[PDB]
Design a protein around this ligand. Structure first.
Ligand SMILES: N=C(N)c1ccc(CNC(=O)[C@@H]2CCN2C(=O)[C@H](NCC(=O)O)C2CCCCC2)cc1
Ligand SMILES: [Ca+2]
Length: 223
């Protein structure tokens, strides 16, 4: 997260860290046994870390659970990042409490102008490299489709939406991948892609979760 602020220990209870010996992507807990992340985060040998704040220090509220199975969206395209969504099932149910909670799926897609909260442990430099150990947060609005498409001609599909600031300075970045974009108490997006980080006229692109609610519900009910 570039140009954001420290969330504060466990203020974003649904945030998860995907770990393969180190943090490599974020994710969202949707219920006690399932995590939603981005397809481009796909990897074998994943441990899901819940109740995390400082990822390098055991503070006492963590739950480390291995993934039993991963399901990448059937139509995921690794070249364009269309349908960048993946589901991860935990080997055992996580204990839900104040510091570890699930986020609700959307009943509809949010409108442009809606303010959202994006969070992650990714890079904090627009031109450089500096990774934080505590969770970072950023409030950002969903941009109009025109602004989004003007920025990335011929690359935006109906399964994507832009969020952030066209002036730059504030944006998600590498390391935040798979993380949540919550607006009005619902999971509206997943940190997917962009051009560099926090660059002028290059806003962040996110997976539009509202289009996948049916797939999510049917898939988890059958696995
Ligand atoms: N909001 C942001 N600024 C932002 C947030 C998270 C990320 C991390 N995600 C990635 O790196 C994923 C896998 C490759 N892809 C990219 O972002 C690529 N650009 C890479 C680039 O131009 O930096 C995109 C460019 C557009 C065609 C698909 C590949 C990148 C940017
Ligand atoms: Ca910790």
């Amino acid at each position: 997260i570039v140009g954001g602020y420290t969330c504060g220990a466990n203020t974003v209870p649904y945030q998860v860290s995907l770990n393969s010996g180190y943090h490599f992507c974020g994710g969202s807990l949707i219920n006690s046994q399932w995590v939603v992340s981005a397809a481009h985060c796909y990897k074998s040998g994943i441990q899901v870390r819940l109740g995390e704040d400082n990822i390098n220090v055991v503070e006492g509220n963590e739950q480390f659970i291995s993934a039993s199975k991963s399901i990448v969206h059937p139509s995921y395209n690794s070249n364009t990042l269309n349908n960048d969504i993946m589901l991860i099932k935990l080997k055992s149910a996580a204990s839900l409490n104040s510091r570890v909670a699930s986020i609700s799926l959307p009943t509809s897609c949010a409108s442009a102008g809606t303010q959202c909260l994006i969070s992650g442990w990714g890079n904090t430099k627009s031109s450089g490299t500096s990774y934080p150990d505590v969770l970072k947060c950023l409030k950002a609005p969903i941009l109009s489709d025109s602004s989004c498409k003007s920025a990335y001609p011929g690359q935006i599909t109906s399964n994507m939406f832009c969020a952030g600031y066209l002036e730059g300075g504030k944006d998600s970045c590498q390391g935040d991948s798979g993380g949540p974009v919550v607006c009005s108490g619902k999971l509206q997006g997943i940190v997917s892609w962009g051009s560099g980080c926090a660059q002028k006229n290059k806003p962040g692109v996110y997976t539009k979760v509202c289009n996948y609610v049916s797939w999510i519900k049917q898939t988890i009910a059958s696995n």
